[PDB]
């Protein structure tokens, strides 16, 4: 899986949450919705790679947000890859969604399908406009809002690892869940609640899990997602959107290969995929 170009677009608004799993993260405001940021991120990636929308063979989306996806803020499904195809003009693309997958797992599966089907230009996109999810005020956990677009050329050669979190190996980590709001009264109310129990050692366990997995490919430089503010400068973190600056630095340094590691808060695992890069 070769990364042709990376696009990223985040809201300018940051919100700080206290707690062990807290931090300062980008947060959409008002009735901003995901397409406002996803479309420019995608176009930025296409322009960098000099790829036209009509040349996109495949669009695969990842977005948990239950509303505030598109112009009609009340639509939840079908998922955002479809309205993206429409506004983008990607009239030849196949579209689907990999729901709560990590980006790393999605890139591996998409590399496999897309190389098998002979596709040349594949868009994998991740985004959130999470006004419809209540943050976890007990732990401080929130999703970062924004959009990330990876324009890729499949090769079929991406390798994959799913690894345990670090820290105490006898620690049973409690996963993220998003239960439905059982008392929706207005169409604009939150539709679900983030629930990620307060676990002070979890941010470091994730980072240790990253480092252990990277040891499977010690010859590779690597990039990673940062979901928590603990021990980060200013407590700021961008979730999976952290990958954008790291990938662009790798491009500046003219790396041809790298390892990308995601944190999956639902499985409480880390997942890595090996990639090629463009100059």
């Amino acid at each position: 899986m070769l990364i042709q170009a990376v696009g990223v677009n985040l809201p300018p608004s940051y919100v700080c949450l206290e707690g062990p799993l807290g931090g300062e993260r980008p947060r959409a405001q008002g009735d901003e919705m995901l397409m406002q940021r996803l479309l420019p991120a995608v176009r930025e990636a296409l322009d960098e790679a000099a790829v036209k929308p009509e040349e996109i063979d495949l669009i695969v989306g990842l977005a948990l947000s239950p509303d505030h996806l598109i112009e009609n803020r009340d639509i939840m499904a079908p998922k955002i890859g479809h309205p993206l195809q429409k506004v983008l003009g990607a009239n030849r693309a196949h579209v689907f969604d990999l729901t709560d997958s990590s980006l790393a797992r999605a890139l591996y599966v998409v590399d496999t399908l897309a190389s098998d089907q002979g596709y040349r230009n594949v868009l994998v996109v991740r985004g959130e406009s999470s006004q419809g999810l209540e943050v976890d005020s007990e732990s401080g956990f929130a999703l970062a809002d924004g959009a990330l677009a990876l324009l890729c050329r499949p090769t079929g050669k991406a390798a994959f690892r799913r690894g345990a979190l670090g820290g105490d190996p006898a620690q049973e980590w409690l996963p993220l869940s998003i239960p439905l709001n059982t008392d929706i009264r207005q169409v604009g109310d939150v539709k679900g609640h983030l629930n990620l129990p307060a676990q002070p050692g979890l941010p470091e366990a994730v980072r240790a899990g990253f480092t252990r997995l990277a040891g499977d490919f010690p010859q590779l430089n690597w990039v990673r997602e940062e979901w928590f503010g603990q021990g980060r400068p200013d407590g700021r973190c961008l979730g999976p959107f952290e990958l954008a600056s790291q990938l662009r630095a790798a491009q500046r340094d003219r790396l041809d290969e790298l390892l990308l590691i995601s944190f999956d808060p639902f499985g409480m695992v880390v997942e890595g995929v090996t990639l090629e890069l463009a100059g």
Partner: protein, 355 residues
């Protein structure tokens, strides 16, 4: 005339569709059932056109939901196919409704939820200790998407056994004050794909494409009931907006023609067809667009309703069970999905265990 090269060419592995089963709701509802008492603008012309005479809805009061019926079906299929739980390399699930309700003994305190999806929890409930879990969505064509994902993993040597699950609890999104509630229905399907040991079964080719021109026509939207009473609360509801003419009639044949062309075959080389089941007129239009005769496919929505992504595997299983599809047959499976999406697959089938 033995060797094309001095070296040996690599070969993609063959994909065996090894086993399939379905699990439908215990209770059936007729078109005059009281559940439709608040639906306006009904008529015998409406019912006859869509071809559904009865359909099932999960009854969570009796322990039926998107998870429990999948556990039942998957355990039955694993045991009947003699598949050791630790030999499953990948589990791919789809569930079109964003609302899940049950996580078994894995997350026993979790009730109505948007996330997580099914695959990870299900792999733990079933003891699939080596299975990579994945949850995909292509609405009514998710079964074909998951067969395609499974097949590509197997072809490239990245999995030797893949369990595929589709579980449709669509009734938890239906507005029964609206005519939109009268066709969709609940059900589950499970299939096992493996690396073939001979040439008897393979996915010869597939074709997937999407078109979002009419994306807004069929959606899940947070809204009040169409004809509410009292202090009704907003819910996530299937919603139909209003033009589309020949869009769905022509695009499934487009996918089938592409798949056949990639397989190097023509319609006349196909023994049998398996279609998504949205309405008799649509299945017939798809069949006529590719040259399939009525004796080469079944209409199955009459007694099940339109089970979103499960209509295709249910119809495949029916054809195998009734002897319409035989070992050695070449078949086409094809359907449409909201979004919209279209998929077709050309299979050489061997022996398929129906269980």
């Amino acid at each position: 005339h033995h060797a094309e090269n001095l070296y040996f060419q690599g070969h993609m592995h063959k994909v065996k569709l090894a086993a399939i089963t379905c699990e439908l709701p215990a209770r059936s509802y007729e078109n005059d059932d009281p559940v439709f008492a608040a639906v306006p603008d009904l008529s015998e012309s409406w019912w006859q056109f869509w071809g559904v005479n009865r359909r099932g809805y999960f009854d969570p009061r009796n322990g039926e939901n998107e998870f429990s019926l999948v556990v039942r079906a998957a355990e039955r299929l694993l045991r009947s196919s003699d598949t050791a739980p630790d030999s499953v390399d990948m589990l791919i699930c789809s569930a079109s409704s964003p609302i899940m309700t049950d996580a078994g003994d894995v997350l026993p305190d979790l009730r109505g939820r948007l996330y997580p999806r099914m695959a990870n929890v299900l792999s733990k409930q079933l003891g699939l200790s080596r299975a990579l879990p994945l949850d995909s969505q292509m609405e009514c064509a998710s079964f074909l998407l998951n067969l395609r994902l499974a097949a590509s993993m197997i072809r490239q040597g990245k999995a030797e056994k893949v369990l595929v699950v589709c579980s449709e609890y669509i009734s938890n999104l239906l507005d029964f004050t609206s005519r939109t509630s009268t066709l969709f229905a609940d059900g589950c399907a499970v299939a096992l794909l493996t690396r073939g040991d001979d040439d008897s079964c393979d996915l010869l080719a597939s074709a997937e494409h999407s078109d979002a021109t009419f994306y807004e026509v069929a959606t899940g939207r947070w809204r009040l009931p169409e004809n509410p009473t009292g202090e009704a609360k907003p819910r996530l509801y299937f919603s139909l907006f209003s033009k589309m003419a020949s869009f769905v009639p022509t695009n499934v044949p487009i996918a089938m023609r592409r798949a056949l062309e990639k397989a190097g075959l023509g319609s006349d080389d196909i023994d049998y067809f398996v279609f998504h089941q949205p309405a008799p007129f649509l299945v017939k239009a798809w069949a006529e667009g590719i040259g399939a005769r009525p004796e080469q496919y079944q209409l199955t929505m009459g007694d099940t309703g339109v089970m979103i992504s499960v209509s295709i595997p249910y119809t495949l299983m029916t054809g195998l069970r009734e002897g319409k599809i035989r070992p050695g047959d070449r078949i086409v499976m094809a359907g449409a999905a909201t979004g919209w999406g279209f998929a077709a697959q050309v299979w050489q089938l061997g022996e398929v265990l129906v269980c």
